Design a protein around this nucleic acid. Structure first.
Lengths: 209, 159, 60, 76, 174, 45
RNA sequence: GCUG
DNA sequence: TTTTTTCAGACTAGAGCCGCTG
DNA sequence: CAGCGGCTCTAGTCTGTCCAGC
């Protein structure tokens, strides 16, 4: 191979840039739009392009709210990630005082490591992504509508317009792929823009629960 | 005639892998298993397959149908978080009242289990208002009726 | 033959156990408005008709 | 006033049904009925002349309510 | 068996005066029935409520107005916009109003092509008066067409309390 | 305190009522073979 | 068992 | 002491299994 | 070198199968 392996490290990085841009992290358009040949210039074959430390990204910063708010995208070399890899990742995050990270695992994650991400801290939140999910940006898939994470001042209008409580809205799971993509948590509302058969649009709403 | 194009139809279930193999354009790959789609592409794409794969199999057999019926059946089936198929099991995750579940299958377990919990059900729907002889809130019952007869909140007498 | 298949019941014998009408023309019978008939009435939206047919004219 | 101006089919059926029961129980008839011996026929005649003494209270799901007079609602 | 299972899950659903289909619990399955808020039975055009071309033809034949101006092109679009913005039609969904304008724009385009092909009216005075009958729309017809379309749309709205869920379950089963 | 976490409503019921000590014999209106079973239970007692 |  | 007489189906426990997880 | 986490697996089991009419 080596042609195929670099292709993944370009598409995954491109999708990770697209996810960060959608989540509101600040990624330059040059990072967002890249070509495999341009990627080859930074690194070419599987030896020179190393998944563990070469592609790690702490560049993303939440420009909208906090310049300090930062996200680390970590790709572990080992196919299944143990707590030991997670503990090394946590220590790097603890020193920098960064509170969010993405871990991009290649085949999976061992069960005792998965349990750690629930309870390591509420103030140190890490999201597992399999790389096989990142080879295709689901927000550009033809069956997935536009999702828009609503502000609290807009949720307060939704519930006022219909005279609802929150627990009467339709639900969306946190384990939902598009919920993971935007990184939303319980009690956020997503606006969903479904396309009509005509030129028009229908607007619907869901609650994360 | 103008363009001859090849699309490979795969019989199988791993949509995530078959939408990543180099050369398969994931953006337009689709499936006929709502469970596979729901796991890989959110709930809202799982709503659109339940619309599509019913409206695909209904026009295949002749049998025209409005989409507004399927737009309701899909939207009921996926409105509580996950796709809740209409079986005996999906009714438990859809309804709160006991007698509507108890008039359906598993009448023994659904009545004892709701006695184990102290289940206060209100009497609503139609599967309970028909059982308890109370007029249903659906249809004619939604609106109450008033008499325009000569009346007024009158003044009292001086005491 | 239509002569043997013609049955009509107004107020007649009611079974002791449930106080509902009988099930046989010979016993004076009474017709069963079953779930499928009940479902069609729910679709029509007729709340009063269901109450009259299933409670007043059966076992109130 | 947010609710639809047009009277719904369900509303017409109930208004006629209550009015017919009221007429069948010796209520005053405001239509000067001519040769009518059936309460439902008399009730339908009253609706056409828009002289039925009933107010429809429409309850919104939250619990708020709006009252519409039978005459005010358009009959299709 | 399938019909019993469907009717034992969708029976509680009913449309409400707020226009939102809701469960007995009060949970919102939908915010508008079928997005549009229209009722499947009232549709006259394959899931679309009006089928405008047929409605205009009925109007032209039922009320064929002799001794009327029969003006067209710029006047047709001007009359339509004035009628659309007259207190009523605000209630009509905005998407419906745009669809009427698209149909009216098409009618105006058809009149222009025919008028150019067979002597454009200089001011309505051309000599073979049969030529005016080629695409004749008169002002009374335009007023009748727009009212009939508003009433047909308003009457096509699903009535609140329609037992929407029960109808869908029976409709899937048949 | 531990009856709520057993998910039992204390007003409706409590854990002991699950095991049987007395059986209410049905009203005779509801039985114009259940009666035969009751006689067998009486004989067994 | 047959009709519906 | 000696035959079967529909066909699935998506729940509920066990049996492990191997490997990191200490 | 030892352990418990999830797995993963096979079977197990109870649950249905149109309306009614004679």
């Amino acid at each position: 191979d080596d042609e195929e392996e670099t292709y993944r490290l370009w598409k995954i990085r491109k999708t990770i840039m697209q996810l960060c841009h959608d989540r509101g992290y600040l990624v330059t358009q040059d990072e967002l739009d890249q070509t495999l040949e341009e990627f080859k210039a930074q690194s070419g074959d599987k030896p020179s392009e190393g998944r563990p430390r070469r592609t790690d990204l702490t560049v993303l910063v939440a420009h909208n709210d906090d310049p300090t708010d930062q996200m680390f995208v970590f790709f572990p070399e080992e196919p299944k990630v143990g707590i030991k890899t997670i503990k090394v990742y946590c220590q790097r995050m603890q020193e920098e005082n960064i509170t969010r990270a993405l871990i991009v695992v290649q085949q999976g994650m061992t069960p005792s490591a998965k349990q750690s991400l629930v309870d390591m801290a509420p103030k140190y939140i890490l999201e597992q992504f399999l790389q096989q999910e990142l080879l295709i940006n689901i927000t550009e898939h033809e069956l997935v509508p536009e999702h828009v994470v609503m502000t609290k001042e807009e949720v307060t209008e939704l519930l006022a317009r219909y005279k609802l409580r929150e627990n009467q809205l339709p639900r969306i799971q946190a384990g939902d792929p598009v919920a993971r993509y935007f990184g939303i948590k319980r009690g956020q509302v997503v606006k969903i823009i479904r396309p009509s058969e005509t030129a028009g649009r229908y607007i619907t709403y869901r609650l994360v629960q | 005639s103008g363009k001859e194009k090849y699309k490979l139809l795969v019989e199988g279930d791993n949509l995530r892998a078959v939408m990543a193999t180099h050369g398969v354009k994931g953006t337009r790959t689709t499936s006929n298993n709502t469970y596979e789609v729901e796991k890989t592409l959110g709930i809202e794409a799982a709503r659109t397959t339940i619309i599509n794969e019913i409206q695909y199999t209904m026009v295949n057999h002749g049998m025209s149908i409005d989409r507004r019926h399927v737009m309701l059946l899909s939207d009921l089936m996926t409105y509580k978080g996950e796709v809740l198929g209409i079986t005996r099991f999906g009714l438990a995750k859809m309804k709160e009242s006991v007698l509507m579940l108890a008039s359906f299958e598993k009448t023994a377990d659904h009545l004892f289990d709701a006695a184990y919990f102290g289940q206060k059900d209100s009497v609503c729907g139609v599967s309970e208002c028909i059982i308890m002889g109370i007029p249903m809130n659906i249809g004619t019952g939604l609106f109450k009726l008033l008499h325009k007869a000569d009346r007024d909140p009158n003044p009292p007498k001086r005491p | 033959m239509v002569l043997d298949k013609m049955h009509a019941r107004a107020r007649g014998p009611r079974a002791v156990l449930t106080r509902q009408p009988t099930e046989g023309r010979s016993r004076d019978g009474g017709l069963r408005l079953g779930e499928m008939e009940r479902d069609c009435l729910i679709g029509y939206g007729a709340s009063m008709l269901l109450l009259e047919r299933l409670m007043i004219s059966s076992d109130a | 006033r947010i609710t639809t101006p047009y009277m719904t089919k369900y509303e017409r059926a109930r208004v006629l049904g209550t009015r017919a029961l009221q007429i069948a129980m010796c209520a005053p008839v405001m239509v000067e009925l001519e040769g009518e011996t059936d309460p439902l026929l008399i009730a339908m005649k009253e609706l056409k002349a828009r002289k039925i003494p009933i107010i429809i209270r429409r309850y919104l799901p939250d619990g708020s309510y709006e009252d519409w007079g039978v005459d005010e609602l358009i009959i299709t | 068996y399938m019909q019993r299972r469907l009717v034992k899950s969708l029976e509680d659903l009913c449309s409400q005066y707020d226009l939102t289909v809701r469960s007995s619990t009060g949970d919102i399955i939908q915010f508008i029935y079928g997005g549009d808020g229209l009722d499947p039975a009232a549709m006259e055009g394959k899931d679309e409520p009006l089928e405008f071309k047929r409605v205009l033809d009925n109007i032209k034949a039922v009320f064929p107005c002799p001794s009327e101006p029969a003006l067209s092109k710029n006047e047709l679009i001007l009359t339509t916009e004035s009628i659309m913005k007259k207190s009523e039609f605000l209630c009509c969904q905005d998407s419906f109003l745009q669809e009427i304008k698209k149909f009216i724009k098409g009618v105006s385009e058809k009149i222009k092509k025919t008028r150019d092909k067979y002597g454009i009216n200089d001011n309505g005075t051309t000599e073979p008066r049969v030529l005016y009958q080629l695409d004749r729309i008169t002002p009374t017809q335009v007023e009748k067409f727009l009212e009939t379309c508003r009433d047909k749309y308003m009457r096509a709205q699903m009535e609140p309390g329609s037992a929407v869920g029960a109808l869908c379950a029976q409709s899937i089963g048949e | 305190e531990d009856v709520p976490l057993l998910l039992m409503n204390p007003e409706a019921g409590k854990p002991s009522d699950l095991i049987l000590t007395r059986l209410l014999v049905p009203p005779l209106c509801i039985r114009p073979d259940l009666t035969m079973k009751l006689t067998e239970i009486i004989f067994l007692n």
